[PDB]
Design a protein around this ligand. Structure first.
Ligand SMILES: Cc1cc2nc3c(=O)[nH]c(=O)nc-3n(C[C@H](O)[C@H](O)[C@H](O)COP(=O)(O)OP(=O)(O)OC[C@H]3O[C@@H](n4cnc5c(N)ncnc54)[C@H](O)[C@@H]3O)c2cc1C
Ligand SMILES: Cc1cc2nc3c(=O)[nH]c(=O)nc-3n(C[C@H](O)[C@H](O)[C@H](O)COP(=O)(O)OP(=O)(O)OC[C@H]3O[C@@H](n4cnc5c(N)ncnc54)[C@H](O)[C@@H]3O)c2cc1C
Ligand SMILES: Nc1ncnc2c1ncn2[C@@H]1O[C@H](COP(=O)(O)O)[C@@H](O)[C@H]1OP(=O)(O)O
Ligand SMILES: Nc1ncnc2c1ncn2[C@@H]1O[C@H](COP(=O)(O)O)[C@@H](O)[C@H]1OP(=O)(O)O
Lengths: 261, 263
């Protein structure tokens, strides 16, 4: 496996290649996409998180979902900058990062991966996310659809499954990896469908779970009839309402994946 | 004055006196109330947080502290803290697992105090009114406040001994068994029925959270904040903020009266 190949006691020294503002000006969020050069040495599968040790050489690491596929030279992450101005520990660190600065990662973590024969089987997917929770799904799509930023005009994909995405963000200027999401949507309209759920519409609260609930029968159809592998990434609450819909098998629980923070 | 007396560099060595399950069986949560003996050495005002450094000793050199709101009053010998145990898969959060495994009389290392989520310095004398808004462990500093204002003493609950302002509490939790510090909260409502009003918003029951309840009765909330010069506090989830603020919005001196601590 690629898990724990690097730890806080022997982290990988990497370099920042790019740092991009991921949101657009109507967003109340501040989120940076980081392109990180790891000399081909950081090993990972799509869905894995990496740890970043702020100000390394307190030695405390933070987890971040990898937003790139295995085949790509550099790796990437999306980091929301937390504020209370004071910043979160890592938040403050990422904020003052400069291009070509050193950054220390800890070996692959987590098990939020694709089934190992997803392309062969054309397995269908339900991806549910909020905020930065979209990152692993972006890494998933980049793999399944053989994405290439320098070669977007070709395809290239042997994946013929159907992917449904439910994504909750504040507004549309808060949708992360919109470039990619809109691209996949245009290039593969028979393979992918996306429902955005914006929290700004309120002020009743209405979130991504509530949308799933509105589409209960359709959601049940996809999971049951199309044997979708079901993923949840973001708010911890998403769980109960979505799990309830399914309940209303052990063979089924292996098809459900959860990563909340 | 008390901020950063203890740091990650010089943490205060304390003792676990008690460790109590704060929720009741129908709760899906696990949360422990820790009584901590700091030998009068840890200084704080009501509303402050302390840091706990998991696995600290005099292993590896991970000094990674987490903040927890103090739920006791200054006058109490020991200090209180309520910690939700975070799980995934089971695996535990970093500090969560450390607290999970904590025994009575174990060493625990504190930093602090931290924060400025504090009462007005003359609240009792001026009998100032309050609106406290909370979710989950966000009730903690409000418990601290109440213990100071109402002169709470576990060993002398049959005495009145209290402040005569009005406090309105909006508290969002999963269900009844998930109410943290239900004993105290029920004791305050029984003993000071004309000085406190608690509104519970249960998420187990579209979504409907604590802000939505407040938006449901926004005119009365407006009247409380404006007609009673209430100090407004918000502790818990970041989202609460905007829904509540908007009603207030539709300023310069009224922002001195609003307090927010989100996590
Ligand atoms: C499996 C997993 C995957 C994750 N993936 C991502 C991801 O892809 N992208 C992403 O952005 N994040 C992700 N996270 C979360 C991320 O790891 C961090 O938790 C996040 O970046 C905040 O870290 P921080 O050090 O900046 O904040 P911290 O310093 O750890 O503080 C945590 C929060 O408390 C607040 N805070 C800190 N100090 C105070 C204070 N004294 N008073 C009041 N408030 C305070 C901060 O504002 C912050 O919001 C993931 C987490 C997990 C567990
Ligand atoms: C001002 C302030 C006051 C606070 N007051 C309180 C309080 O009174 N009571 C309280 O309980 N908390 C409070 N908090 C939050 C608290 O400080 C901690 O953030 C909380 O205890 C979680 O810390 P942890 O080390 O156990 O989880 P961490 O290890 O830091 O991880 C954070 C979350 O991610 C999950 N996670 C970690 N690693 C993984 C992984 N590898 N894969 C998947 N998931 C993972 C954990 O389960 C956890 O839910 C407060 C925070 C602030 C900023
Ligand atoms: N309990 C919840 N369940 C699902 N989504 C939520 C919940 N609380 C907030 N959200 C939403 O998740 C999205 C991303 O949040 P974040 O930026 O904190 O990661 C936002 O739209 C946020 O709405 P809100 O605007 O109410 O915060
Ligand atoms: N965006 C939100 N705004 C207000 N309350 C929320 C939000 N998301 C969750 N909650 C609720 O706050 C309470 C405390 O949560 P926690 O246990 O995480 O501290 C829970 O009832 C939780 O409901 P839910 O059951 O939907 O998570």
């Amino acid at each position: 496996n690629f898990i724990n190949l690097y730890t806080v006691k022997n982290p990988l020294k990497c370099k920042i290649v790019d740092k991009i503002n991921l949101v657009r000006p109507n967003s109340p969020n501040e989120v940076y996409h980081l392109e990180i050069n790891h000399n081909g040495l950081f090993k990972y599968l799509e869905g894995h998180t990496c740890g970043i040790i702020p100000y390394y050489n307190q030695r405390c690491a933070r987890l971040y979902s990898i937003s790139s596929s295995n085949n790509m030279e550099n790796l990437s992450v999306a980091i929301k900058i937390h504020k209370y101005t004071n910043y979160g520990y890592c938040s403050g660190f990422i904020k003052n990062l400069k291009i070509n600065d050193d950054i220390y990662l800890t070996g692959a973590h987590g098990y939020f991966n694709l089934p190992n024969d997803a392309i062969q089987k054309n397995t269908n997917f339900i991806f549910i996310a909020t905020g930065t929770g979209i990152s692993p799904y972006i890494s998933f799509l980049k793999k399944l659809f053989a994405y290439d930023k320098n070669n977007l005009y070709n395809r290239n994909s042997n994946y013929t499954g159907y992917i449904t995405i439910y994504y909750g963000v504040y507004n549309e200027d808060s949708i992360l990896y919109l470039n990619e999401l809109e691209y996949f949507q245009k290039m593969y309209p028979n393979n992918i469908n996306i429902h955005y759920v914006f929290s700004y519409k309120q002020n009743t609260s209405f979130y991504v779970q509530d949308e799933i609930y509105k589409r209960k029968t359709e959601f049940l159809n996809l999971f049951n009839n199309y044997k979708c592998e079901l993923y949840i990434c973001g708010k911890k609450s998403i769980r109960y309402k979505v799990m309830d819909i399914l309940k209303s098998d052990e063979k089924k629980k292996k098809r459900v994946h959860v990563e909340v923070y």
